[PDB]
Design a protein around this ligand. Sequence first.
Ligand SMILES: [C][C][C][C][C]N([C][C][C][C][C])([C][C][C][C][C])[C][C][C][C][C]
Ligand SMILES: [K+]
Ligand SMILES: [K+]
Lengths: 317, 317, 317, 168, 317
Amino acid sequence: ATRILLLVLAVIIYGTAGFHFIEGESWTVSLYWTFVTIATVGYGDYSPSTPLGMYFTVTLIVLGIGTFAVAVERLLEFLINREQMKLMGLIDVAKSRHVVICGWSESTLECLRELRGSEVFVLAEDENVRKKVLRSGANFVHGDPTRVSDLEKANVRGARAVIVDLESDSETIHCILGIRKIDESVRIIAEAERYENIEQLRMAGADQVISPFVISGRLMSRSIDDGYEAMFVQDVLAEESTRRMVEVPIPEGSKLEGVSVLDADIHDVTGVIIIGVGRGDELIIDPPRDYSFRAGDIILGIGKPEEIERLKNYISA
Amino acid sequence: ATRILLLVLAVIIYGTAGFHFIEGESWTVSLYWTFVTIATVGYGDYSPSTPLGMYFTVTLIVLGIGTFAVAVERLLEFLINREQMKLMGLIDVAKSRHVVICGWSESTLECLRELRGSEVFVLAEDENVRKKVLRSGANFVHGDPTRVSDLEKANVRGARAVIVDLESDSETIHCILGIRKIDESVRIIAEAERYENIEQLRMAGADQVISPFVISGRLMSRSIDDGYEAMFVQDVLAEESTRRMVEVPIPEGSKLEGVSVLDADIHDVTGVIIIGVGRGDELIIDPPRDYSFRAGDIILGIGKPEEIERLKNYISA
Amino acid sequence: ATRILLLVLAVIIYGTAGFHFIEGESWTVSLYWTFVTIATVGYGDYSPSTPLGMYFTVTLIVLGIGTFAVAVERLLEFLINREQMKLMGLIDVAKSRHVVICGWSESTLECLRELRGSEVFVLAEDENVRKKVLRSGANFVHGDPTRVSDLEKANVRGARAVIVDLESDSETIHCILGIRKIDESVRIIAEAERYENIEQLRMAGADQVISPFVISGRLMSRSIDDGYEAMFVQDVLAEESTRRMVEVPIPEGSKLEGVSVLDADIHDVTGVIIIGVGRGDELIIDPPRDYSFRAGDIILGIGKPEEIERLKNYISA
Amino acid sequence: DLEKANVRGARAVIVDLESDSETIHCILGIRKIDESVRIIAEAERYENIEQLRMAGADQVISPFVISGRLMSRSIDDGYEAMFVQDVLAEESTRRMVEVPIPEGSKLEGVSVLDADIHDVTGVIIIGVGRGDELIIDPPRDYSFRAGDIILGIGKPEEIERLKNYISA
Amino acid sequence: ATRILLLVLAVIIYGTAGFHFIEGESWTVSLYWTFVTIATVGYGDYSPSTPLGMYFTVTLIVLGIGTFAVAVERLLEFLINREQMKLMGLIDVAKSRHVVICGWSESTLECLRELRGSEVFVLAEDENVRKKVLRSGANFVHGDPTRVSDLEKANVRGARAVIVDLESDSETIHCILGIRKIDESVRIIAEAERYENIEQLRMAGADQVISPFVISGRLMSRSIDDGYEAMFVQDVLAEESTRRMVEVPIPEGSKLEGVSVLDADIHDVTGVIIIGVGRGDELIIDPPRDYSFRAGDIILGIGKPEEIERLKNYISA
Ligand SMILES: [C][C][C][C][C]N([C][C][C][C][C])([C][C][C][C][C])[C][C][C][C][C]
Ligand SMILES: [K+]
Ligand SMILES: [K+]
């Protein structure tokens, strides 16, 4: 590790002391000559005429090739070890605004097409998951996501948001309970599977719990006869064929600070069905007529992509 | 990536500015001297006599070894990463007339002995399939063949023909439906397993559907008593012991353009039993007596390998 | 392996004999010139003027690059082979005071947090065990721990203590019987699973047999009604919340050599409940009133971490 | 499926599964069915002992932490392992005993120094527990009541002498 | 592959033509100068004074570093590819007196302790078999031993003897039938499992068929009452505690050529129980009294290791 610098300094001290007391030159001239001889430059302005010195330069050359052959071997061993350990996970995350994805399924592949490639770290343990992650453009960190000692190797303490989606519900509850021991303020998005585990995932400490299987179980049993709400849910939340569910923030100023929903009249001006208003980590669906807008609120509404532009300019000042 | 060139230019500018304003030489002489000193050639025609310059060349030499040690480390990291990613698939196909084989079974191993080695790309996902492909002389591309995003890594848009043979019929139908979304004109050869899936493989968009298990199921149940058609099918299509089923194209000119099958009389002249004629992506088995040959047609017939030569010269002009 | 030195000496003898009999210089001058020319230093003080010698130096240069290209290739082959064999186990242990851990479970992971990282060698055969060991900071040696020929690759003859914890009891008995064939004096700590195998593990040759499942099976069936001994066992042996079970050795001198337990009165002076005394590989739990302490004995007692310090200074001289 | 086994209104539910996460998820379901039943878990890793107590278990027994701390301390000395293996596992000579104090029997209101329990019976008194709270090493300024549980280590010769000393 | 030599010759022709027509030196002087400049020796006896040539040497140096950076990259790619392919099998056997072992079990591990390490090639397909072979000191060749195209990669045509021991009997019969298609004269030693397959293994073409399970099935059912023949079979063929079953060849001369077994009287002279005589690929157990010995015969007998030495000197001349 550091003995290479010791051997280099040893051969420099050997070359200086050998040249100075045999050729009889100055100390700076011997220093310059051994830094030209070790690097195999060979200016040839201060070559030794003495055959004793001519035998000394042979020892200096073989020692210089020896140090060059130990240093290249150490560099190659370090590089091969570092690039074999980096390939199969086995590395510590050094970033500070990354997104950790615990587990790997189809719902985390679809949230990878709206994020960056270098921003995400997938923390899993299986072997084909590594190849799927390296194909999809993420970084793979080998580790058990339920273990607390392997949740810190992905650096969950300095993460932006953590996305938990494991193969069962029990591992999801244990992964949330393991994350909330490390950092109590990080944002956790969890995926439930059974209906009975949503309150368990919320009490474990998740900030947002999504349950897709309950949504499909309710939409399948109400699409046997007619199936009209399934068309709305599909065409708005899944595909976005002609509509889109977007939210808009209210900026500073914003030309509407203080008016009511009766006086704003967003729907008949713009064409956006206003669902609810986001006043500080709560959702008031169908706000009453006397609700006054404020600064920094979030308006949730459904509209065509040409009406969202008509709304975003109506709300800006 | 590109900081290596920046560091190289930085040390060249450092060496030129150091030599020019200390030794007092020309700018071209300093440029030539630092390109001889960095590369460790050392002509020694312009060595510095000044001990300040003699201390400067030590800094130039250590910086040159520093750039040579960062560039070799970057080249070794790039080479080890590229040759570990190339080994286990994980690569993008850059060819433009290749043949993509989705899946791997015995029927695709037998079609690899009549093609080239570098022309084929096997697109599969299992682990022992990679070693069988690397032994048989093909190229292995790791990917799920039903996924559309992994059908483009094998470059199915610029492929010659695609051969689909997966473990079930459902994956064959899904792979054909995934290929026909990308390129609607590429040629697909598919292998059916059950009898009921041949019309499904044709409606999915395959150009040629082969069903070997239906052929064996019909030949097994008609070989219990006597077994005479199984001998013909085996000795003609499988082994080609003494006969062969070949086709011959009609070239331009070709000395028979316009005659009928009664006036050509191919069988009693040559010795080839004429089965059918290939008039443009259709097969007229047992053509009638008034059928007139044209240019570019394909004559399908059974004959000994000494009669195919007697036919191929009868059809050429 | 050693032909590289032969080729190097061959090219040195070729260069010396070529320069001496063409340029007509001394033997030492030719020796110095070929050691400057092979290493590409090039002082240029003895360059050949003769065009025959000028053609000879071309052969010397191409041969020097040839030896440098065979030596670098041999070094790279040796380094890649050694660092691929070292990665997946496959190595022989050279240490002499290490601790060999046969098998891998949760009870050997918890004994790795109180030992060093480089002192332990885990001898197992599975594939994910290698990654868990390389994450936990140990060294992995691939081998079957029941096989005698693979117990010597971990160097069990010169080991400090061996810890046996395998997946069944039969492999534990066979691993103890395999270790006791090699070295009859090494210390073996074994983990039993069933109650009936404790006498079998002791007769096989283990020095200390621990059975955690019997302890849990007794503590579960006595915690249905009240559960008072389980609180003591947990809070003392497992977590050490407020108490600790420690032992203290009696040093030379030690101010209490010869007194009885009635005259020492350790409990009412210090606050440590004295359980037993360790007189030479035996345990006298609840020693009688006439027991006299000696030198080198071991006092086993339960106490708060502020009372162990009051005991350790009461026993020192 | 936990209601098919009738965990509502039982003596105790003893939970030990193939991993820790299923143990936590089983305790979190039993506490949804019955809030007052007694649950005896079994922790595998050391970091999950507080998780089982926060989930709702009344008693957590972690054998692998015990065996992992005992394997690392018996490399040189090995005297704690002899004590636990002779008292808690095999019960060859000594055993741990818990005895209740019956009503009005020779010991209500007397201190521990004039109880003279180590010298007339021979059992080593580890601690006394009252109301699910274990007082290890009770001081001299302590009194016994009717209903306490005395925790001791002794031979079957001395356990019977303690049980006769504790009688009226 | 060979474009490296083309680029090297291109830069040599560029350097010669550049130096000769600018400096005005001879062709040999320019040849010597570019072979000193490309190799970075730098004698400095023929440095260019012209600034046009001083700009030319910069181009020559950058081109020389370019060729050195393409050649080192090609050598490193070749070495990494060759040492990753050699690790996991995937190689062709080039030897000519080796022993191929098809499959891997306990009976082939015990025949590896009486052979060399570099003489054997284990031809199997599993993954842990590779690590067991690399630990036991053999060479691993990845291939399916029933496939004829993978029996030639182990070079079974130029092998000394082939040892077949696979997991079933059907694969043993198919491996013998695959070997006998390639070379009809090679020696095959096969291991049977069931009693009914010994005649099938002999008709398939094996030269020696061993069936250990039939021997154990007969020795188990005759050791219930007394068990006397099992002691003989174990102590003679398995362990060789005090006896040994050896064979001795009769050399040329040999002092006993022509005598009968009555006149030789080997047992009462030496102490070896004579079982049979090996007259040319047949075994005459219990030879009659009139059998005359010849040259090159093989005497099979049981004796103590001090009686085999008394027999081997009685048979030599
Ligand atoms: C620019 C680059 C340069 C390089 C040089 N080298 C030399 C070596 C010597 C040995 C003895 C290489 C050459 C090659 C030719 C072919 C290296 C150096 C290093 C220093 C550190
Ligand atoms: K040089
Ligand atoms: K290198």
